[PDB]
Amino acid sequence: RRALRLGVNGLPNSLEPVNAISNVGPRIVNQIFDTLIARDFFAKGAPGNAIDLVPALAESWERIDEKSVRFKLRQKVMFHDGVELTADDVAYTFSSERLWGPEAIKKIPLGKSYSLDFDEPVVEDKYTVTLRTKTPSYLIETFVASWMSRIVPKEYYKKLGAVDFGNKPVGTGPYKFVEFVAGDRVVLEANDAYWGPKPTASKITYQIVAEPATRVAGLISGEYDIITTLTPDDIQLINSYPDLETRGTLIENFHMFTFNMNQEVFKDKKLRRALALAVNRPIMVEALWKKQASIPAGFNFPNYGETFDPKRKAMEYNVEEAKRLVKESGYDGTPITYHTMGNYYANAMPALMMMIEMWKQIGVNVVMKTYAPGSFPPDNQTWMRNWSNGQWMTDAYATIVPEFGPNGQVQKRWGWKAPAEFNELCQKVTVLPNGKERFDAYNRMRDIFEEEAPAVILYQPYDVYAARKDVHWKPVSFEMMEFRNNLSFG
């Protein structure tokens, strides 16, 4: 079989699947591991955006009541080191010890804040396990299909510990670990003992090429089979080569900028709001995205299903109100830094250059500060920074509650003093079933989010890849690459 060569924007600092949650980790850990339930993006001929959930490590499952789901595990599934998958591995994956309890904070810093209100799993037998929540949760199934729920081997993971496991991962997935050179490459090889569709590449190499121009050159020269994280300005050149093409899709993620609200100038909402109200998103979408990016009506996305609000108004744009907020905030004209890891995010620096000019027109002076991969700056040296959030559930709970809620990092680490009402609503939507009360609570949370501006949503990126026409592979509407029954050569 052909070896697959990928030129990527970046690499995660660990292959521990929860710590690898980012724009760059899932395309790798999706190959090493499996989940109990998987999303089939290609269900019923869909162009990589189907919402259908299908059996994966769980052959079947059944919701018992408002807070428990029983899973019947596929038998004779082997981890890469030979160990057979059992309910004990699944129980460990979703345990207090490894994932969501207080002891897990050191190993998986965001484990607890991104998890449901789990109770300890119950192992019924070697192939039967029940996942439970202490309080009602109708999100167990969507959680279990998500990037939080890749199944790790209990004994091997405990032996190494989360850090060393992150450098030598073992999973049940179609590709097994070969090597990891931090900040340079990850190499995987075919797991020919895979339980599902057999791997079609002999090897996969994820080679970091941080500068997108160099990545495009690598595809043109024949060094890479597929490249990631391009902008729509690269489409015409790549498609001019008869043996190459672009493959793009709008993904269930939003780009944003956010603030270190421990900094004096951002403790209060006024200047955060001034900066938010001066962003002309449609002009950025036209200039940098060739109309392909999508601007959402607040923290509100169609993948939320029953908790998506299609009637919501656009996020405000008001240059004159922004000018008045700069004056009322007492802002004295001092430059404010905005950190970016180059173009880790497609259009990060071009968007920042536009926003710097928009902010100059309201009297705020912003300056770019770049940081290298793996060297995220110290928190107290950051003021503004760019970020993104993958919308990882078929529900509005994610990402507003896990990221911006009372137990989340935006309030605890980055100092957002959220109104008490916002936190009360976060607690309510966590346990309520779908209905008018829950739907209205998310809309009020969205309104407070826009009023407070702890972050400023820019748009959903149009994720552009480029590939050799002789490498058959279709993108999916999420920040990952799927190769199961979706990778062939010739």
> Which tokens hold the place of 44?
């019923």
Q: Is 399 in the site for ligand Y4H (CB under 6 A)?
A: yes
Q: Is 376 in the site for ligand Y4H (CB under 6 A)?
A: yes
Beginning with the edge strand found earlier in the chain, give each strand of the sheet holding 68-73 in spatial order: 58-65, 68-73, 128-133, 118-125
The residue within the footprint of ligand Y4H, chosen from 22, 86, 246, 382 (CB under 6 A), is 22
Q: Is 148 in the site for ligand Y4H (CB under 6 A)?
A: no
If one counts every other C-beta atom within 10 angstroms of the C-beta of residue 236, the result is: 10
Q: Is 479 in the site for ligand Y4H (CB under 6 A)?
A: yes
Q: Is 387 in the site for ligand Y4H (CB under 6 A)?
A: yes
Q: Is 253 in the site for ligand Y4H (CB under 6 A)?
A: yes
Name the one residue in this structure whose structure tokens are 């993620």.
Answer: 253
User: Least distance (Å) from ligand Y4H to the CB of residue 138?
Assistant: 20
Contact positions with ligand Y4H (CB under 6 A) in 184-203: none
- Alpha helices, DSSP H only, in 82-234? 87-93, 111-114, 140-145, 154-167, 212-221
329 appears as a binding residue in the annotation:
no
User: Least distance (Å) from ligand Y4H to the CB of residue 325?
Assistant: 27
User: Least distance (Å) from ligand Y4H to the CB of residue 181?
Assistant: 17
- DSSP label at residue 88: H
Position 38, amino acid: A
User: Least distance (Å) from ligand Y4H to the CB of residue 409?
Assistant: 8
Position 417, amino acid: K
User: Least distance (Å) from ligand Y4H to the CB of residue 415?
Assistant: 17
Please say whether the beta carbons of 241 and 222 come within 8 A.
no
CA–CA dist 46, 52 (Å, integer): 10
390 appears as a binding residue in the annotation:
yes
Nearer to ligand Y4H, 23 or 207 (CB): 23
Q: Is 21 in the site for ligand Y4H (CB under 6 A)?
A: yes
Nearer to ligand Y4H, 173 or 405 (CB): 405
Q: Is 14 in the site for ligand Y4H (CB under 6 A)?
A: no
- Alpha helices, DSSP H only, in 329-455? 348-360, 397-404, 409-412, 420-431, 436-452
Please say whether the beta carbons of 24 and 7 come within 8 A.
no
> Which tokens hold the place of 112?
């607890």
Residue ranges that bind ligand Y4H, judged by CB under 6 A: 21-23, 253, 376, 387-390, 399, 403, 479
Annotated binding site for alpha-L-arabinopyanose: 23, 387-388, 390, 403, 479
